[PDB]
Every structure is written in structure tokens, then in C-alpha cells.
Amino acid sequence: WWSTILGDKEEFDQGCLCLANVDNSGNGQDKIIVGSFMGYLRIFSPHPAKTGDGAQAEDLLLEVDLRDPVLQVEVGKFVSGTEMLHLAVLHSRKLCVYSVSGTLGNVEHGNQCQMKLMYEHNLQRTACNMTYGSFGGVKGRDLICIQSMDGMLMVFEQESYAFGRFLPGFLLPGPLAYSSRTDSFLTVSSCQQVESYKYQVLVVDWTLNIGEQALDICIVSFSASSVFVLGERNFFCLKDNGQIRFMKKLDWSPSCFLPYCSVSEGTINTLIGNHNNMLHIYQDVTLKWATQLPHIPVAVRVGCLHDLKGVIVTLSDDGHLQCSYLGTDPSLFQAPNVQSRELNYDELDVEMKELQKIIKDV
Amino acid sequence: TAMHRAFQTDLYLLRLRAARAYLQALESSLSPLSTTAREPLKLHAVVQGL
Amino acid sequence: MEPLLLAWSYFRRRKFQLCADLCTQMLEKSPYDQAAWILKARALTEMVYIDEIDVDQEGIAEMMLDENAIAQVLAKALFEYIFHHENDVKTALDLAALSTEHSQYKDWWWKVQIGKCYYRLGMYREAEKQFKSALKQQEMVDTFLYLAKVYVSLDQPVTALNLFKQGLDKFPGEVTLLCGIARIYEEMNNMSSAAEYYKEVLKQDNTHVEAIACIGSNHFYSDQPEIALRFYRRLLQMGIYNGQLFNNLGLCCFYAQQYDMTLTSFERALSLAENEEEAADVWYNLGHVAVGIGDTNLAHQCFRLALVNNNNHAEAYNNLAVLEMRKGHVEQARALLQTASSLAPHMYEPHFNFATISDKIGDLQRSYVAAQKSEAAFPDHVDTQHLIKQLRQHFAML
Amino acid sequence: VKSMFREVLPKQGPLFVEDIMTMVLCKPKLLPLKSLTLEKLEKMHQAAQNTIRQQ
């Protein structure tokens, strides 16, 4: 369907891709945001490119170097007194917020945004990663935490830094998220304890031993509130009190995952990527469809691509951004949630016989 | 009718590939069977051989 | 610091060999850094790491590799983990027992691991009391694969059943439980109730590889050689591309009478074969093709090349010396069956076949002990019971 | 007058009239497919010979 190769010998991991419409456009047509271990932030919007045996121009819209490592980018509402969306960018020793503004110049590489740094925030420690959420129960806006490398929580409100405490049970930094419904900071240390500290200004609330470490934590609700944790070998689904709803044992080893939208009540769909270039879609434990990939993903998101829903982006660690290669029809795990150029040739052909010039082949 | 001629010309390489690998070992006499001096030869690693 | 992050970010994308050198590059920068010490540990762990037994998934076996369709049908926690790839079980057990006495609950992981150390050596019962206590506090899928692993090796097939219907109703529709239950049924050859469960691991999870062959083999025997092909052309399209599969794909197309892919699949199977003992078996199955067309001169040098590429191939010694008895070489044939039996002290087919050469001559004493073992190694045979009673009339009187 | 195409088949076969005691062959075997642990453990052990072939 579409491909590109970005940069040269630049590395990436998870947290270096999102999919939203940060410029607060009325049509809601979401845009790609790509970080790097250099500062080479891109913003994409791949136009529908047909099978015409050519490379279409102006694939990139803007590119701003920051000459610094970009750990993890985040979209969200990060200016008080407005409901706009603002890209938040983390460096290894500094924290930035770039309010996006669409320039006077239009499409085909007119530098669609200039980097309007609203407020840089100095760092006391170097960080691992971070997340965003309306902590405390405020409406409209969303605040920003910081997990340090040695591990401590520096919460930042849009006006200023709020307060700081250390993270107990630390031996090595793990992933981290904030639950919206149960208003707690869900993390997992290196001692295999999935923990959830209370937001209040430490003693643990409730722990759970899960057997191993975990790459990524995601929390969605649609209503059913459910905490998902993909471990190194297994794959959990936690209830809010600390109940394992179900599990699944993986013989392979996963790379990145994302529990996007559902099709039925109670059901919720999940995508997993192997290291054997295989993708797996998943109703809660029930496998549904699984087809190959050109490479090993390191992050996956799901957004809208030019008013088409059910889009799958596959960012690697080299610079690949090949997306949604139309297995049978580029749809969600719902029963054909979108056609999205479903008109094509075929899928899963039958005959494997050559039957051509086999006579007189001696 | 295409299937019949597909079998013969694939089997015709099979007789050649077998005999070219048969005579490759018969002249070297790798087989544990003989005709002139008429014994076979079986051999094994025993349990105490560890 | 960029070296510490790039070390940890190499572990996330599991670039392991690029991680351990960069982590120990940070080792001399400090006297002791606990983060790099466990990262140098844990990146060295996942270079090789296997847990289960050699679980190689057959399609044609009942007992000692017999054929079918003629029979029927803290930081120290991961420092503990560096001992488990080195398999020094007793040394790990000290600091395992030291740390579980340091925190004597809330660690089911340390409970099931010490039981895994006890099963790794041979302490069956001491393991059997150990991780049962962890299951009474925690619901985890691998612990059901731990209780119901030691009990099968303790040889109690009904005690395996209760766990495989206990945890199946707390983890509903789970895959690897439903494969563990249909694997002990094939151990007792309960294929009346085995192949229904393998129709459930294919109901959901429609690409599990080791439950695609074990249905696509149990249809090739008992006369469904067309359905068994459909389970093997699909397993090709996943893209595994072995040498063993182009054998099985060659056999199913011939017996289903599909003469196009029947033999190109064998020439690709002769190539890309790993060991020299492995290209014997593809020559041997080619012999059963060659008997099917009727060419015996072709068939005589297919088992021979299977035999010169691998001696002690017990199924070929018997199979070569039926072709000898078709010609007339009696004393040649009766020595190959004599050494086919001594290689396979199971597998009734040389034993019965000895007692129709050595019966036509008249030696009714060796042709009894021949057709004695063709009863003990396979009872309910027809033409053994028409032969022992043929001999026991001669032994009483005239 | 288009074509005759009359090739009358005998519609009968050689029925057996008794069983004969004969010699039967070993049956053809389907090779097992090795697991992804056995594929890994063989690949690791195959490289374990070449690192000791030089040392």
C-alpha cells in the first residue's frame, strides 16, 4: 500500500511514534509523529499512492532537527486555558513543549509548523520515559509526569513543576502508566510486582506478582475498564482491583502491542508482533487472523489515514515506516470495519502446480 | 492428459538420479551386502560404550 | 546518560550481543553498578534459554517409533537465574532457599522455581509437595503445566486429567492447556478422545503448527489421504520450509492420486536435507513409491541407497528382503530379516515375516520362536493366530 | 455418425476365491516436524562443534 525509508543509521524504539491530529483540525484527520535518537522529528500524511510504478514526491511535510536524543513523544492537551492538542517532546536532560501552528504555507514541504516552544522545563535527573493524564480528576486538560533513570516522580503541570518523590522498590526502570478511572499510577518494577501507587502526596496500595518483566503497559476502556500488560513471555489482562481476567502463553517472543477498539461488549481486540515478522490480531484470547510483515516492528499505533479507519503503522528501529500492506482488506479486527481500498486482486491462492514446460524439461 | 506426461519426465530423471548415486557407492562397495563372499555385516554401539 | 539508555534500549529490541559488550564497557567506569551488573547478567541469560523437554511432535508413532495403518487407526533473583542456563541446580538452591526464608510469603515465583529445581534433578515428591502450595494461592497457566508435568512422569494418567479440567474453567479456551491434554491421550493411544481436542486447538488458534500435523497425519492413515493433504499444503503456506515437510507432502499427493506434485516434492526433499542419516528416510519413502509403479529394479536400489546412507535402518532391511524372496534368494533374505529383528526388538513385521520363510522350508522350531514374538509385540494379528495354531497341531501329535 | 466411441469394458473383475498366506512390507512413514525448541537447540549445538573445532 505504502512504504518509506527515513533517515540514515538512526535508531528507534517504542514510544517514538504516535497518531493524532495535534493541529486541532476540524476534520480530525490524524497525523504521524516520528521521533528518533537524533532530533529529526518528522510529521507525515501519506497521500493515497496508486500502483503506478513511481515514487510520489513531497512525502514529508516538515522536518526540524533538535540536535539531541528524543526519547518519547506525546500528543495531548498541554496548555492551561485551552482545549488544543500540543506535542510534548522529551530529551535525555531537557523537557520541551511545542504548540503546533499551521503556517501560512500549505502542502509540499513548506515547513508546516515552526517550533514554538511554550515552556522548556529543566531536569534535575535524566529520565527513562513518561506518560500523560488528567491526574487529580481535573477536566479538559492533561498533566505530565517524569520517571527518572534511577526512578523518581517529577510531576509537571502546564504552568510549573508540581512536586517530587522517589519511587520505592526500584532496581531497574520499567514501564509506567496512569489509570484514568481508578486514578492511580500503574507501574512495574524489576521485582516482578505490578504496582499502582496513589496520586496523593510513600506506602504501596496493592501489588501483584506476575512472574517476569514486561515491555509495555496499556490501559483502555470502552463500558469495561481493563489493564493490559504484555510481559516478556506471557500476556496478561488485569482487572482494576488486582484480578487476572485471563492470560495467554506465547511460545514466540513479542515486540510491541496495542489494544485498540473492540467489536463487542466484553471483547477487546489486541495486536501482537513477533520477531519472526508475523503479526497476530487477538480477540481476548481467541486468535482471529495472522499474516506476515516486511520487518520486525518496534512500535505500532492505530489511527486514521485520509478518512480511512483501521490503519496499522509499523515503525522499525532502522527507519522503516511501511504501513497497512492490505492482507485481505485493510480493516480493524472488527468484522470488516472498513474497506479502505479493499478492491484488489486476491488473497490466499490455491494451486501450487507449475504445469508449464515440464514436458521436454529433460 | 497433462498430468500423465508430467509424471514420466519427472520419473525419467528419477531413474537417472538413483543409478548415478547407486553406482557412486557400489564401485566404492559401501553396501553391507555381497554376492561372491556371501556374508552381511551389521555393527552397533553397545550400552557399555559410553 | 546515553550509554546506560542505549544499553537498556538494546535489550528492549533484544539486540543481545550488541548489548553485553556495551554494558560491560560501563563496568570499569564504576566499582559496582547494580543496574549494569544485572543487565550484563540478563542479556547473557536470553542468548539461549529453553524450558520444556524435547517435545518433537510426531505424526506416526505408538511405542518405540512404530509405524501405523497395519497395526490400527531482589537483584539476586536474576543472579539466581544465571545458574539456570548453566544448569548448576544445587548451588542455585542454596540462595533460592536463603531468599525464600528472607521473605516467607508473597513469592509464588520462588515457590514454583524451587520445585522446578527439584524436578530438574529428580526430587519428584519434594517437588510435588512444593508447587502445589503455590497453586492454592495463584492462578497461573504455567503452574498447571508444572503440576501436570511431574504427575505424568510419575505415571498417573488420571491425575493429569483433573488439572486439565480444573484450570480449563478458570482460563477458558486456553490453547496450550488444550494441547497438553491431547498429548497424554496419544501416549495411551486414546485417539477416540485425542483428535477431538486437536479439533479445538484448531477451532480457535487456526495456525498452531504442532496440532496441524497431528491431525494431518491421523488422516493419512485410516484412509483419508486427500484430507491429510489439505492440512499439509496449508502448513506450507505459513512458510516454514523444512526438508521433513517435503517428504510428507510427497507421500500424501501420491496416495491421494495427484501425480503432479508427487515427485518434484521428493527431489526438493533429497536436496536441503540436513544430516546424512536424514536423506536415508527420503530414499526409503521413495521405495514405497517405486513398489507402487511396479518397477522392482528401481525399488531395489531405493532401499539400498537408504541403507548405504544409513545402516541400522531396521524398516529397510525387512523391506529389501521381501524383494529378494520375490526373486528366489532364500538364504539371502533369511539373513536380512535375521538382522532386521536384532535391530528392532519390537515392531512385529520381521518376526512374522521370518515365520513364513522358515515355515515353508520346514524348520518348525525356529518358525515358532519367530511367530512367538509376532504375538507378544503385536497381539490381535490375524495371520499370526492362523500360524501358531497351525504349528501347535504339529507339536502335539500327527 | 459423429462418432462411435464404443469401447465396451468387461464390467467384471478377478474375484478372489481363497486367502493366501503372503509376506507383507513395512509401511511408509511420515517424518515428524521438529519443534521450535528442537530447531533452536540443534542450531545452538551445531555451532557448539565449530567453536571447539578451532579451540
From TrEMBL, chain C:
GO terms for cellular component: BBSome; centriolar satellite; centriole; ciliary basal body; ciliary membrane; fibrillar center; perinuclear theca. Transmembrane segments: none annotated. It is found in: Cell projection, Cilium membrane; Cytoplasm, Cytoskeleton, Microtubule organizing center, Centrosome, Centriolar satellite. It comes from Homo sapiens. Keywords: Cell membrane, Cell projection, Cilium, Cilium biogenesis/degradation, Cytoplasm, Cytoskeleton, Membrane, Protein transport, Repeat, TPR repeat, Transport. This is Tetratricopeptide repeat protein 8. It holds the Pfam family TPR_8. Part of BBSome complex, that contains BBS1, BBS2, BBS4, BBS5, BBS7, BBS8/TTC8, BBS9 and BBIP10. Interacts with PCM1. Interacts with CCDC28B. Interacts with PKD1. The BBSome complex is thought to function as a coat complex required for sorting of specific membrane proteins to the primary cilia. The BBSome complex is required for ciliogenesis but is dispensable for centriolar satellite function. This ciliogenic function is mediated in part by the Rab8 GDP/GTP exchange factor, which localizes to the basal body and contacts the BBSome. Rab8(GTP) enters the primary cilium and promotes extension of the ciliary membrane.
